[PDB]
Each structure stands twice: as C-alpha cells, then as structure tokens.
Amino acid sequence: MLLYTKKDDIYSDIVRMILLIKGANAKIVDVSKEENSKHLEELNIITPNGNIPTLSTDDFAVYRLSVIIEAIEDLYPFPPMFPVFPKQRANARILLEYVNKTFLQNIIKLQSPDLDEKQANEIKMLMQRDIISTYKKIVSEREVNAESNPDAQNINVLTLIITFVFYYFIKLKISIPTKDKNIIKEIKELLSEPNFIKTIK
C-alpha cells in the first residue's frame, strides 16, 4: 500500500487524486527528494525502468498508469470510475487510451528541458486543436452513461483526467481556443470541485 510519486508529474498527480477519492492509506514517497535515496534505490531494484508513478504492495508491484488504475478499482469497492455496462466500459477504456496517447505523451515530451522551439509549438497547437473534440466526446460519453443509470453516485475517471489535463494546460500557460462561454463555465466548475482541491493545494 505504498505509491512512489515524483513532483511535477501528471500521471503521479492523477494517481494521488484517485487514492484521495478512495481515502485509503497511501504512503506517498518522492523519488526526487534526497531525503529517501535508499527507498528510491529499492524502487530501482524492484522496477527495471523505475517508472513513476509505481504502486507497491507486499504481494505484487505494478507499473503503468492504466494498469495501476485498474488494479486500484479491483482492490477497492469504493464508488467506481467505470460503467456497470460492458460496452460502455469498453468505450471508456478506448477513450482513455486515445486521450493518454494523444496528450499525455506530448506533455511528457514537453516536460524535458532539452525541448526545441518548433517541436514545442507544434505540440501545443495540436493539443489546443484536439482539446475541444476530446472534451465534447467526454461530455457525450458521460451523458450516455448517466442515462442508463440515474443517481448511481458513481464518479467518472475520464472527467477527472480531462480536468487534470486542463489544469496542466493552465500551469504550462498554453492558451485554450474556445469561444463558448458555456464550455469555460463548465471547465471552471470542474476545477472548483472540492475533492480535486485537496491534491492541487
């Protein structure tokens, strides 16, 4: 029940938010901090590439954000981030995979300090262009999932991931090309959610 985390990492922040929703016992460990060099070395021995965030348990150790989220869902009977219906679950999984490949990889590449200006500009432009389409698809999927079950009291992981991507876009200082007041108000409401605030502060 220990999760290895690195500050300034989008995947690690998302995993921490998922644990906070669970409110489970999470012993966050920072690989970057020199306070725990020995623990980071133990993480390197356990994990070949030392991928972060890495969830560590006595029975097993797992790597990769999607695998970690699925394992957390199996471990906890707390409100689910996945739909009761299998077709809906498959669609949500495909949407999450597409969002991770299109935006998460670009964010990781931009994170490096050796970035070139042309590559950074092209990545930012592509992210701004696809952000509206991704948000529209997520809203449509959320509405379809809600129609099947009313008052399910189930939180959708994809909406949380979109909110985290928007927060990172704000932190990078990138500009969002939306002329719609409704979209801006909805994004602000998602940013104003109380559970999200605990990880952000």
Binding site: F60, V62, V67, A71, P86, K87, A90, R93, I94, E97
Partner: protein, 202 residues
C-alpha cells in the same frame, strides 16, 4: 444473438481472438478479409483493421481492449483468474508482452531481408528463450491455477514463429513442460492443416 468476426490471415491477434471464441464455446461466423470486395473491405473500416469482430449494434476495431471486451461480454468460464492478486499480475504480464514484441516478429518479418540477418536474429532469439527457460516451472499454462487469457496470447506467438520456420521444442530450453500441454486444449489446436481428413475439413 448472432455474432460474426472478420480476421486477416497470419495475424497473431486474430488467432488469439479465434482461440478465445473457441474457449467461450459461442457459435460465430468467420469471414476472411481478402475474400470481401476491396471497396466493401474499405467501407467496414476507413483506417482498415483486419481483426475487429461484428455485432448488430456495436463494432470494435481495438485489439488492445478487444480480448477484455470479449471476456466481459460472455459469462462463460473466464480467461482471467478469480483471485484479485493473480488477476492484477496477469494484466501486467500481458502489458509486458504487448509493450515490446515488435522487434521479435515485425523486425524479422520485414527488417531482416538478408538471410544472415534472419540467422543473426535467430541466435539472439534462442538466447532470450534460454533466459526465459529459468522462469515459471510446472505451471499448468502460466502463473495461475486455471487456464488463462495470457496462455491464449502465447499460442498466437508459437504458431506465428512456427510459420517463420523457427520451431523449438527440446531446443527452445526447458519450456517443453507447458508447450505440449497447451496444444492439448481443443481451442488451441486450430493452427493449420481417408474419412478423418474429410470430416475434419468439413
């Protein structure tokens, strides 16, 4: 109700899907992509994915989640372990095979044009198999008490490699314990071709 699957010849994932359907024991219609008209073949998928599967109201062209969707749709004996810890470990093992298997098959298939280059790849592959030899021993199909989806994934690689003229049983290292057992399952034994021959072909 009625379910049909579209498959491409010599595709490892297509073979994996066929094996999963055979284990599920659900009757299905199998259609070769090549036989279909080319414009018609393009119409089903604009990108063009040979292994998708066919349903009246839904279509999936994603191989990564396709096996998981097939398992969830059918409540027949599962291909995933009941124990939560084993289920978590199996997914990580599947990710490990999927993340870096392009060099094993794609590079040899197209990159190794030279006969020596194919031979150079073969020696490295044999050494990697020997390193894997010091691994799970006596497992029925893998690190599980029951048949698992991951065992189905290995079958597709074994048939594809055999088609590549790289057959190892006693020369593949000490992995012979489970290789013979895997062929035992009826669904797995569908890789390749007086009354018996005709009845089998029917």
């Amino acid at each position: 109700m009625k379910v049909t699957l579209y498959t491409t010849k010599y595709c490892p994932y297509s073979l994996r899907a066929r094996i999963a359907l055979a284990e599920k024991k659900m009757s299905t219609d199998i259609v070769e992509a090549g036989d279909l008209e080319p414009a018609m073949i393009k119409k089903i998928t604009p990108n063009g994915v040979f292994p998708v599967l066919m349903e009246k109201d839904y279509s999936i062209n994603n191989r990564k989640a396709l096996l998981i969707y097939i398992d969830e749709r059918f409540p027949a004996p599962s291909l995933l372990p009941n124990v939560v810890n084993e289920r978590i470990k199996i997914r990580l093992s599947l990710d490990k095979i999927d993340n870096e298997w392009y060099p094993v098959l794609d590079q040899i298939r197209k990159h190794r044009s030279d006969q020596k280059m194919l031979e150079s790849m073969f020696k490295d592959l044999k050494e990697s198999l020997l390193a894997m030899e010091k691994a799970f021993t006596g497992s029925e199909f893998f690190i599980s008490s029951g048949f698992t989806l991951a065992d189905c994934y290995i079958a597709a690689l074994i048939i594809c490699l055999e088609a590549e003229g790289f057959i190892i049983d006693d020369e593949y290292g000490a992995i012979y314990e489970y290789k013979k057992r895997l062929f035992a399952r009826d669904s797995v034994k569908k890789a390749n071709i007086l009354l018996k021959t005709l009845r089998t072909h029917r």
